[PDB]
Amino acid sequence: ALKVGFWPAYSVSEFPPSKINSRLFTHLYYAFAELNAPTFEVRVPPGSEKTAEDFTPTVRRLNPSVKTLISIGGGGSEVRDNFAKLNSDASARQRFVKSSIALARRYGFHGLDLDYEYPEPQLEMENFVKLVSELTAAIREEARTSGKPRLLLTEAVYFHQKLFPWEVVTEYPVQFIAAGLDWVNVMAYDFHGSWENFTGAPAALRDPSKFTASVGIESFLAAGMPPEKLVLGIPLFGRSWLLKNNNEVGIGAPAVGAGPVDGALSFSEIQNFIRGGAREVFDTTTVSAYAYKDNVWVGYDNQQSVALKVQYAKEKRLGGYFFWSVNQDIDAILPKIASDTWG
Numbered sequence: 642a643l644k645v646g647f648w649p650a651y652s653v654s655e656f657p658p659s660k661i662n663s664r665l666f667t668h669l670y671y672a673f674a675e676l677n678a679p680t681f682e683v684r685v686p687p688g689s690e691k692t693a694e695d696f697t698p699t700v701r702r703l704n705p706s707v708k709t710l711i712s713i714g715g716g717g718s719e720v721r722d723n724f725a726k727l728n729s730d731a732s733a734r735q736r737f738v739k740s741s742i743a744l745a746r747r748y749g750f751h752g753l754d755l756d757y758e759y760p761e762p763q764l765e766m767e768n769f770v771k772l773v774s775e776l777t778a779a780i781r782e783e784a785r786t787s788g789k790p791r792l793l794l795t796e797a798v799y800f801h802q803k804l805f806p807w808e809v810v811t812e813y814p815v816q817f818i819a820a821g822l823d824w825v826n827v828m829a830y831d832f833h834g835s836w837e838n839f840t841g842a843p844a845a846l847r848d849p850s851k852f853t854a855s856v857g858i859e860s861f862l863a864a865g866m867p868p869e870k871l872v873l874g875i876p877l878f879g880r881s882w883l884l885k886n887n888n889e890v891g892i893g894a895p896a897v898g899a900g901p902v903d904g905a906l907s908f909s910e911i912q913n914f915i916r917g918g919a920r921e922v923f924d925t926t927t928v929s930a931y932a933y934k935d936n937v938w939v940g941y942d943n944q945q946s947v948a949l950k951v952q953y954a955k956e957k958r959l960g961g962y963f964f965w966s967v968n969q970d971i972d973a974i975l976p977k978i979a980s981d982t983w984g
């Protein structure tokens with residue numbers, strides 16, 4: 642059972658790695674190493690070398706069995722642009738592969754992760770295939786020469802197997818992925834947010850809508866992905882809106898922009914929101930929660946919806962679950978219920 646957490650280096654001042662409850666995880670990811678175009682000598686952001694080095698020893702002090710991976714990239718457009726430039730250039734791909742493996746060993750990580758959002762259109766999938774095939778081979782070669790177990794290799798994927806389900810330009814090659822990677826982290830959230838002028842469940846497990854975690858998972862399984870290669874993503878943040886009218890507070894209510902903070906609110910801040918007078922509602926239709934006060938509305942996962950999602954993952958025979966990102970639940974409320982549920 643994979644119990645995965647992502648720790649983002651940006652959060653180091655307020656949430657250093659020592660604050661992670663690593664007893665609740667099997668694998669903890671450092672986010673992110675940078676691609677470092679144009680050389681593509683992959684590296685942690687200069688100035689964070691000590692934080693990167695200390696990450697794994699620190700988290701293992703509370704749970705020595707926990708393993709770590711370093712994630713390369715991130716969800717931004719600059720990262721996507723850099724992957725697209727990288728993957729078209731065979732020499733650059735070689736530099737990336739060599740440097741990424743050396744990076745993981747340098748800092749004591751047990752694996753590598755690619756966060757490329759997303760390998761589309763078709764040309765970009767084709768070139769990403771070249772990168773990942775070369776990386777898989779180099780990982781196996783390094784295990785042979787070094788004598789150590791091979792580095793784990795994972796990647797972030799869109800919630801759905803098709804890019805995109807409403808207009809298919811390419812799709813994740815599941816047999817390829819299952820052969821070359823240990824698992825994929827399915828980003829089964831961010832379906833709805835302040836970019837829409839109505840409230841919704843940002844990470845709905847299901848809906849009687851096609852943008853749901855279950856529909857996405859179904860698509861990977863239908864394509865032939867071994868269930869154990871799928872790790873279900875669960876957010877530790879909510880998406881927030883400003884309401885058009887304070888007496889329209891349910892799902893589908895009209896909205897007029899992003900709520901705090903610029904449309905995203907950590908679970909810990911949502912707990913504060915509720916303690917400060919917001920009303921929490923569990924929505925059984927979507928398997929999600931929302932909370933509102935005056936003109937602010939936030940959709941998120943709570944103790945009930947997380948337990949239901951984790952049991953869903955168990956019933957669908959998935960490899961496990963992941964949380965993005967662990968700094969957003971400072972008391973580790975949701976990681977605790979998730980771990981208890983799978984156990």
Ligand SMILES: CC(=O)N[C@H]1[C@H](O[C@H]2[C@@H](O)[C@@H](NC(C)=O)[C@H](O[C@H]3[C@H](O)[C@H]4N=C(N(C)C)O[C@H]4[C@@H]3CO)O[C@@H]2CO)O[C@H](CO)[C@@H](O)[C@H]1O
Pocket residue numbers: 647651712714715716717756797826828831874878905965966
């Ligand atoms: C470089 C930069 O923009 N730094 C920002 C920093 O950006 C963060 C946040 O915007 C994250 N958002 C939330 C709601 O947590 C964002 O998370 C993305 C991530 O990139 C993707 N990768 C995954 N994986 C599971 C691998 O999930 C997604 C998530 C969720 O959509 O990540 C970016 C950096 O990539 O934000 C901080 C604080 O706002 C800011 O100070 C600055 O450092």
